[PDB]
């Protein structure tokens, strides 16, 4: 197919390349230390007035 003929001469011929596909995707972000005070935003003792 790559030589465009049905008969190929003696020799060694380059063809489609070899490629090791990735096994899977891995993601690594560091630890979490500070988070927004949702306990003071949504869990307030008494909500403000309109």
């Amino acid at each position: 197919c790559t030589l465009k003929s049905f008969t190929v001469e003696k020799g060694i011929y380059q063809t489609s390349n070899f490629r090791v596909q990735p096994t899977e995707s891995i993601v690594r972000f560091p630890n979490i230390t500070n988070l927004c005070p949702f306990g003071e935003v949504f869990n307030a003792t008494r909500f403000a007035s309109v």
Partner: nanobody
Amino acid sequence: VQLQESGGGLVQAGGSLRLSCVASGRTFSSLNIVWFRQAPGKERKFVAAINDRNTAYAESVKGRFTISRDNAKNTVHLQMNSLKPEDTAVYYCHSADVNGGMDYWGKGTQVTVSS
């Protein structure tokens, strides 16, 4: 816990009263105060909110009410002038930071204006 309340009492017209609202803590310079009053048998209405260093009063309390704060002793003094019988109400004072948190409920003192 709660907010300590004082300054209430039963007085006749033309007298002088000074309500007090003190909130314990260590960040008084960032505290904001919202006031309310609840008349017996009537609706409870907002009185005066002194936030940062700004002051304001409602229709029936403007000029009559002279709100003030004491940064030295965490004290809020409200000078009372021009007593009116219809203003007999229980005043609930509120203390909070700029966020609106640290919400403590004031018990409220009995204030009466005699006709």
